[PDB]
Amino acid sequence: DSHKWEAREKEHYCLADLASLMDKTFERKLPVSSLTISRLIDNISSREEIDHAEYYLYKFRHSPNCWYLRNWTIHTWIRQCLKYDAQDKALYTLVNKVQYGIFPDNFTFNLLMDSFIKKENYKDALSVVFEVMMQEAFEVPSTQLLSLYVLFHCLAKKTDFSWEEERNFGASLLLPGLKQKNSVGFSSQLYGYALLGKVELQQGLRAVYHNMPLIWKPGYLDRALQVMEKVAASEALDVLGAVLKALTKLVEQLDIEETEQSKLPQYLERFKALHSKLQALGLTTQLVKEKLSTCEAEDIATYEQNLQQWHLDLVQLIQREQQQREQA
Amino acid sequence: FFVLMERYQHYRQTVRALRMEFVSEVQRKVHEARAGVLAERKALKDAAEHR
Amino acid sequence: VRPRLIAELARRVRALREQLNRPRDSQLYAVDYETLTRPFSGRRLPVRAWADVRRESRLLQLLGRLPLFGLGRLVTRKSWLWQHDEPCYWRLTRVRPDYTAQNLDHGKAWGILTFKGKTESEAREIEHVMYHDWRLVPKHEEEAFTAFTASVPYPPLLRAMIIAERQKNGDTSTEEPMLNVQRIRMEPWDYPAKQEDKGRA
Amino acid sequence: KAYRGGHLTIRLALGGCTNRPFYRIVAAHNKCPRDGRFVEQLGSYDPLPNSHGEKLVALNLDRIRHWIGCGAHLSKPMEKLLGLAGFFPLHPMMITNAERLRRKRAREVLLASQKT
Ligand SMILES: [Zn+2]
């Protein structure tokens, strides 16, 4: 809803003084203050203003004040994008999140999740969710909704082949770990785990460190072993991949750190037996919805509290700057 | 080369210990030189002879 | 006396130029992602650098890749990974950014410096930090590097020398004085060198 | 015009004439020449031994120890000499050179057993 953008504290839509101060700070190499960027963000009202604010933020990431990117700037930017468009600029920023630093470490997670789920989006929303959860996610009352969306778009996306696709699937299914019941989910999880372990150990020399930023230990199959133990204490895609793969000097590795290369048929037989056992023992969307029936409260009180606190901080900073400029 | 490096680390630890011991020996020498009661007694005797 | 004012003024102007034109670690130090060289200087790189500059990235940009400048994110160095299993990574808690390049590459960061399981804050000089040998370790799979749960009298030559000297003076006395290695630690062969004798290039 | 007298940097220079190898230790700073502004000028060292093999060496460590206590670094020649002298333990470089000599003698035995 648009009611989540009331404490705006507008100033002036004109870019004259703001651009002048920014150019002065960039030429004299002076550290830029977050007040100008916050004013520019609050004064957004068109594509030109959005592009100007994005360029100013990009320069701020290079200006002497690389830090001082207070959370209120990202808050106001995300809120204005959600209330205006949030299609290309917001999508590009969320895909990058390095050249601008739009870290949504607040209720912006739940805000975006609700805006993308209630409106029922598809490809763009899925890509944004993947790109924003690749790093950190799951916190504010929206983890169950995000997991539901991810499971839906994964059951609707059963393909790999490519290297980047497999890497993205693995990075997206790594952090989520609480659906102790799903079948295809854990199947794809174990499949990606095995593929990444093989790529890191029993594969080429280069693809060992740069590709996957994981641990350098030789016990990668131990993760899949622990996963299957946890799921069958009391699958399909991985078995299909194994069946498909059945029919086919500077050394950067320690001698003791041997790679379990000569290992294939025994592991495949064990995995087939374990998959048969699981099928003998033990859609998920209904269970996830039933779980969500309890949560999904949307506590905007924290939103307003943070907004008020940050607005007070910004007003105090502006007053301090005005006093320093006048008394001096 | 691993034997090289192990023995070099041992020698470096010993050299640091011996540098600390050299500092201690310089302190002892400065003490024996300045605090030497012989010089002070000779100066006092010379002052008494002058008086 | 008449001080050489021409030479003094020339040297002062040269020093002022060299000081005010102080180039950050991005202008002339811009590392190439193909030829494996550096402008301005124009010197070669070690044999090990045949692929270390093209396979991995630096530390500060690896942190910047994560949110909050990696204020509480782990990150291990590939060199120590190659030559060390004990906890010898960089657990950051106060990163200083760099304002002279994109992607937050090339900078001067400082913080907790763990060494053999000793979280030292503001330790000695920090070498092997501006190289392209680092492994990213986000929140997932946090701890991993943590794989870690001479004081001897004089040699025989000095022993015999002191014994002979004491025999010359009086008794023999075979006892020897003890020493300690409490000051400087036990730096291994793969220890980051000290920047004490390294000004700048 | 301003000296330093801080950390030392023993630098060597085998200057001489043909058929005449003779050491020449020179203690100074890292940013100073050999014959220029220095800290302490010590005597030279005897490389080869005298007649009937009797390598005599005059240990002039009296002031070297004081300078080390006050701050003085060493080089490879001084380090090896202190190691093989008596104060410091046997230099590890020379012990490993003896180990390499043992390996060379083993290789010579192998070659003598293989060839003829
Ligand atoms: Zn000569």
Curated annotation (Swiss-Prot), chain A:
The lineage of its organism: Eukaryota, Metazoa, Chordata, Craniata, Vertebrata. InterPro entries: mS27/PTCD2, Pentatricopeptide_rpt, Ribosomal_mS27, TPR-like_helical_dom_sf. GO terms for biological process: cell population proliferation; mitochondrial translation; regulation of translation. Overexpressed in hepatocellular carcinoma tissues compared with adjacent non-tumoral liver tissues (at protein level). Ubiquitous. Pfam families: MRP-S27. Belongs to the mitochondrion-specific ribosomal protein mS27 family. RNA-binding component of the mitochondrial small ribosomal subunit (mt-SSU) that plays a role in mitochondrial protein synthesis. Stimulates mitochondrial mRNA translation of subunit components of the mitochondrial electron transport chain. Binds to the mitochondrial 12S rRNA (12S mt-rRNA) and tRNA(Glu). Involved also in positive regulation of cell proliferation and tumor cell growth. PPR repeats lie at residues 70-104, 105-140. GO terms for cellular component: cytoplasm; mitochondrial inner membrane; mitochondrial small ribosomal subunit; mitochondrion; nucleolus. The gene is MRPS27. This is Small ribosomal subunit protein mS27. Transmembrane segments: none annotated. It is found in: Cytoplasm; Mitochondrion. Residues 296-328 form a coiled coil. One of its GO terms (molecular function) is tRNA binding. Component of the mitochondrial small ribosomal subunit (mt-SSU). Mature mammalian 55S mitochondrial ribosomes consist of a small (28S) and a large (39S) subunit. The 28S small subunit contains a 12S ribosomal RNA (12S mt-rRNA) and 30 different proteins. The 39S large subunit contains a 16S rRNA (16S mt-rRNA), a copy of mitochondrial valine transfer RNA (mt-tRNA(Val)), which plays an integral structural role, and 52 different proteins. Interacts with NOA1. Interacts with MIEF1 upstream open reading frame protein. Interacts with METTL17.
Curated annotation (Swiss-Prot), chain B:
It is found in: Mitochondrion. Keywords: Mitochondrion, Ribonucleoprotein, Ribosomal protein, Transit peptide. The keyword NADP does not apply. One of its GO terms (molecular function) is RNA binding. One of its GO terms (cellular component) is nucleoplasm. One of its GO terms (biological process) is mitochondrial translation. Belongs to the mitochondrion-specific ribosomal protein mS26 family. Component of the mitochondrial small ribosomal subunit (mt-SSU). Mature mammalian 55S mitochondrial ribosomes consist of a small (28S) and a large (39S) subunit. The 28S small subunit contains a 12S ribosomal RNA (12S mt-rRNA) and 30 different proteins. The 39S large subunit contains a 16S rRNA (16S mt-rRNA), a copy of mitochondrial valine transfer RNA (mt-tRNA(Val)), which plays an integral structural role, and 52 different proteins. This is Small ribosomal subunit protein mS26. It comes from Homo sapiens. The chain holds residues 53 to 103 of 205 of the full protein.
UniProtKB/Swiss-Prot annotation, chain D:
Its main location: mitochondrion. It is found in: Mitochondrion. GO terms for molecular function: structural constituent of ribosome. One of its GO terms (cellular component) is mitochondrial small ribosomal subunit. This is Small ribosomal subunit protein bS16m. Keywords: Mitochondrion, Phosphoprotein, Primary mitochondrial disease, Ribonucleoprotein, Ribosomal protein, Transit peptide. One of its GO terms (biological process) is translation. The gene is MRPS16. Residues 1-25 form a transit peptide. It is linked to Combined oxidative phosphorylation deficiency 2: A mitochondrial disease resulting in fatal neonatal metabolic acidosis with agenesis of the corpus callosum. The keyword Metal-binding does not apply. Component of the mitochondrial small ribosomal subunit (mt-SSU). Mature mammalian 55S mitochondrial ribosomes consist of a small (28S) and a large (39S) subunit. The 28S small subunit contains a 12S ribosomal RNA (12S mt-rRNA) and 30 different proteins. The 39S large subunit contains a 16S rRNA (16S mt-rRNA), a copy of mitochondrial valine transfer RNA (mt-tRNA(Val)), which plays an integral structural role, and 52 different proteins. bS16m has a zinc binding site. Belongs to the bacterial ribosomal protein bS16 family.
